[PDB]
Amino acid sequence: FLWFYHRPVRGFDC
Amino acid sequence: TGSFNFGIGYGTESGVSFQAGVQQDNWLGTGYAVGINGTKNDYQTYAELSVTNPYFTVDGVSLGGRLFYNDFQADDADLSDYTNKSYGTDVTLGFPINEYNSLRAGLGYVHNSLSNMQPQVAMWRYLYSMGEHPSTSDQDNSFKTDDFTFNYGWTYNKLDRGYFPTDGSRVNLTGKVTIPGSDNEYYKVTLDTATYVPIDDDHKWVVLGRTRWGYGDGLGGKEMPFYENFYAGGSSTVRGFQSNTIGPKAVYFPHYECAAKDLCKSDDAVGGNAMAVASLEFITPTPFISDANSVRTSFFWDMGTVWDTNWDSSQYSGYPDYSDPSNIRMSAGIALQWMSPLGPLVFSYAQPFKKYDGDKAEQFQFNIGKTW
Amino acid sequence: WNWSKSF
Ligand SMILES: CCCC[P+](CCCC)(CCCC)CCCC
Ligand SMILES: CCCC[P+](CCCC)(CCCC)CCCC
């Protein structure tokens, strides 16, 4: 939702 | 007119990440942008076709549809081992509510194909809830589901600027629920918040408060599938902890290995159906440099926990109680962000000064370019 | 890094 925080593990809808 | 692209990024969460796509706005004059994209990193390969009309109505209600497939290798994600090859499709209406708020509603179909699951308690407890009874003594297994979901989203964005924000907040709420007819039966909700409060008039001194919340559970006697678990730990969540280390750890059956005539504790993370992260971060002027407005320096305090609400302690009194939400991990550290010529760059060094058994440390973390 | 070229 915001760089660089809370990158999904199962990408890639961030 | 259209374009193509390719990209490379690198980070401790993902390793090397490769992106490539072709895109065309207003494809064949339909009013729909059409994209075909793929991304690959150490543990995942994903491709999709998207078809998107941002002005499905003249008011900027958007309609998007996608097809995708995914290959996920859990062991390369620092999890207990399984393979999940999936594919599906979704359709999403995007509603602009006002300057600061948008909503999303969507339907999704997904086919999950699980194989190569190393037998472990939490995973098998899910499988059993599904009426499935694979052997506990080998990795030769297969488990397939077909789910239909209602997908909803709310984004609140009132940041002063997107590049190094100094003021305002961003909130993202995502939910989904299976629709009758699905194999799985569960709901899942995620909430991300970031709030920036500037201290000085020049906004060079900024307090960031960041949270993350995840809760999902089965409806009826079914559990949320493990392949939808939340994780924490890593360069973007709780710094100083190895990717995905925080929370329950696999309890393997006789078959880190357990290859042994008893159940075997491990330090392989499996995630959980509940998760919470909070972080306080003080942004300060970058020391021993001057201009200074292209770098952001900060000190932070990171905390997080992950748990398994269906972990059955009474049966497994001899093991850590993975249903306990109160094993809060904490780290302190420093971070730097910079728009490098290789693309957006973040570096952090952080010490995990509160951890639990099996948790793994990763003091130095970074991410360069797109890894998302 | 990301390289992008139109046609
Ligand atoms: C590239 C042209 C896209 C056309 P649409 C549907 C095509 C059917 C095969 C896109 C739907 C996205 C979910 C539009 C339908 C209007 C109601
Ligand atoms: C500096 C911004 C702090 C924002 P909050 C506190 C986050 C803890 C790290 C709320 C503070 C109220 C006074 C988080 C609101 C969403 C749960």
Residue numbers in the entry:
A (entry chain C): 2 to 15
B (entry chain A): 423 to 677, 688 to 691, 696 to 727, 730 to 810
C (entry chain D): 1 to 7
Q: What did the authors write?
A:
For two of the structures, we crystallized the BamA β-barrel bound to darobactin and then soaked in either CP1 or CP2, and for the third structure we co-crystallized the BamA β-barrel with CP3. Our x-ray crystallographic analysis shows that, in contrast, CP1 (B, pink), CP2 (C, yellow), and CP3 (D, teal) bind to the lumen of the BamA β-barrel. CP1 and CP3 seal the lateral gate from the inside of the barrel via interactions with residues on both sides of the gate. In both CP1 and CP3 co-crystal structures, Q466 mediates interactions with the peptide backbone. Although the two peptides interact differently with the β-barrel, both compounds trap the C-terminal residue of BamA (W810) in the interior of the barrel. Indeed, both darobactin and at least two of the peptides (CP1 and CP2) can bind to BamA simultaneously. Consistent with the notion that the peptides bind stably to their respective locations within BamA in its lateral-closed conformation, each of the high contact frequency residues were within 4 Å of the peptide in the crystal structures. Although most of the key interactions identified through MD simulations were also observed in the crystal structures, two additional interactions were observed between CP1 residue R11 and BamA E650 (which can rotate to form an electrostatic interaction) and BamA Y653 (which forms a hydrogen bond).
In recent years, our understanding of the mechanism by which BAM mediates OMP assembly has advanced considerably. It is now clear that although BAM is composed of a variable number of subunits, BamA is the major functional component and is sufficient to catalyze OMP assembly under very specific conditions. Biochemical analysis and cryo-EM structures of BAM-OMP assembly intermediate supercomplexes have revealed that during assembly the BamA β-barrel shifts from a lateral closed state to a lateral open state and thereby enables a conserved C-terminal motif in the substrate (the “β-signal”) to bind tightly to its first β-strand (BamA β1)25–29 in an antiparallel configuration.
